[PDB]
Amino acid sequence: DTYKLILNGXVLKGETTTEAVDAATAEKVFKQYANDNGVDGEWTYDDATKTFTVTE
């Protein structure tokens, strides 16, 4: 499936997508991308939209 990532860094925002077989795998990809790019914070998932948010 296509999963989405919302990255909220206070006044700064971003977003991205990945293809993955399930949600746990997409989150591993999203958590590495977020961390590689300086974005650390609280994670939540909307399984109705297959969208993760990381909030600084």
Author numbering: 1 to 56
Which text from the study accompanies this structure?
Thus, we chose to engineer the loop L1 of the 56-residue immunoglobulin-binding domain B1 of the streptococcal protein G (GB1).35–38 The solvent exposed loop L1 in wild type GB1 is a type-I β-turn with lysine at the i + 1 position and threonine at the i + 2 position that lacks a COi+1 → COi+2 n → π* interaction. However, to have a better control over the turn conformation, we decided to introduce a type-II′ β-turn. Through subsequent X-ray crystallography and computational analysis of synthetic GB1 proteins with amino acid substitutions at the i + 2 residue of the β-turn, we show that amino acid side-chain identity and its rotameric conformation have a direct influence on the strength of an n → π* interaction.
Encouraged by this result, we next incorporated serine with moderate helix propensity, valine and threonine with low helix propensity at the i + 2 site of the type-II′ β-turn. With the decreasing helix propensity of amino acids in the order Ala > Ser > Val, we noted an increase in both d and θ between COi+1 → COi+2, suggesting a gradual weakening of the n → π* interaction at the i + 2 residue. 5 with the strongest COi+1 → COi+2 n → π* interaction displayed the maximum stability (TM) and 4 with no detectable COi+1 → COi+2 n → π* interaction showed the least stability. We were surprised to note a very good correlation between the TM of these proteins and En→π* between COi+1 → COi+2, in the absence of the stabilizing COi⋯HNi+3 hydrogen bond.
